[PDB]
Amino acid sequence: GCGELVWVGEPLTLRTAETITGKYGVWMRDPKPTYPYTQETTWRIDTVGTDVRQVFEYDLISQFMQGYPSKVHILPRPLESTGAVVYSGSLYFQGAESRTVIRYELNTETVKAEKEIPGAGYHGQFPYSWGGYTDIDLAVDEAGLWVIYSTDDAKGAIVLSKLNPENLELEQTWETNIRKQSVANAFIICGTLYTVSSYTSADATVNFAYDTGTGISKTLTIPFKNRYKYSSMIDYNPLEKKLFAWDNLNMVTYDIKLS
Ligand SMILES: [Ca+2]
Ligand code: NA
Numbered sequence: 001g002c003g004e005l006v007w008v009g010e011p012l013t014l015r016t017a018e019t020i021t022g023k024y025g026v027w028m029r030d031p032k033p034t035y036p037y038t039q040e041t042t043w044r045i046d047t048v049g050t051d052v053r054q055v056f057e058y059d060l061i062s063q064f065m066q067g068y069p070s071k072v073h074i075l076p077r078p079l080e081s082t083g084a085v086v087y088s089g090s091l092y093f094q095g096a097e098s099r100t101v102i103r104y105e106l107n108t109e110t111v112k113a114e115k116e117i118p119g120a121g122y123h124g125q126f127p128y129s130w131g132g133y134t135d136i137d138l139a140v141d142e143a144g145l146w147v148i149y150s151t152d153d154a155k156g157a158i159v160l161s162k163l164n165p166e167n168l169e170l171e172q173t174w175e176t177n178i179r180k181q182s183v184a185n186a187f188i189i190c191g192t193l194y195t196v197s198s199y200t201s202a203d204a205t206v207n208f209a210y211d212t213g214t215g216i217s218k219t220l221t222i223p224f225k226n227r228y229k230y231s232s233m234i235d236y237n238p239l240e241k242k243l244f245a246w247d248n249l250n251m252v253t254y255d256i257k258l259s
Pocket of ligand 2: 082083084085137138139234235
């Protein structure tokens with residue numbers, strides 16, 4: 001069920017952080033769940049601070065919006081920003097003050113792989129427009145794991161590389177002409193990169209698209225609402241066919257429609 005994005009729905013709040021620690025963060029579900037996890041298993045990370053290690057894990061979506069965690073993982077090293085992703089039983093996150101992506105197997109609590117994203121800017125070089133060290137942004141779509149970033153050679157333009165989920169080797173790389181810092185966030189649907197215009201506006205838009213298949217760039221004007229006017233995280237879940245987002249203490253989801 002692939003196609004081009006033609007519509008985004010109203011934001012739906014599933015849960016709200018009670019502490020300033022959760023001002024921005026990342027929540028997630030596995031698009032390719034494996035034992036002992038299911039499609040309902042939800043992970044949460046409040047990413048405010050310099051010592052971000054705690055990952056809240058919820059077996060049931062019910063626990064996740066109305067209860068306590070079923071488990072809390074302590075990451076081996078501090079985590080950077082809100083770009084993390086869970087895929088096929090592993091948490092993929094960026095080590096604090098680095099351009100290193102770590103593959104953290106959740107069930108075994110083991111580090112299975114680490115790789116330096118070649119030439120990638122980090123720690124405030126090429127963040128999204130709101131800052132927050134969002135230089136490196138992992139993504140999952142119908143084809144698997146990606147990483148969104150930029151380099152000096154790209155002059156801050158969004159670069160996206162297809163990643164091997166086992167060893168984190170770059171399989172292929174595309175260079176866009178979209179300034180990453182000029183955009184609120186980005187995600188990938190069916191091999192097409194999309195960007196959001198603003199992180200504060202209730203009247204923002206999905207304003208750009210870049211297709212890896214054809215290399216064509218396009219301007220869009222699909223409405224997109226930041227209900228709480230501070231979206232720190234915007235990701236696409238290819239299983240639910242939905243956008244997951246974190247907006248000013250609030251854990252939200254958007255419905256979408258594809259051509
Ligand atoms: Ca994103
Ligand atoms: Na991400």
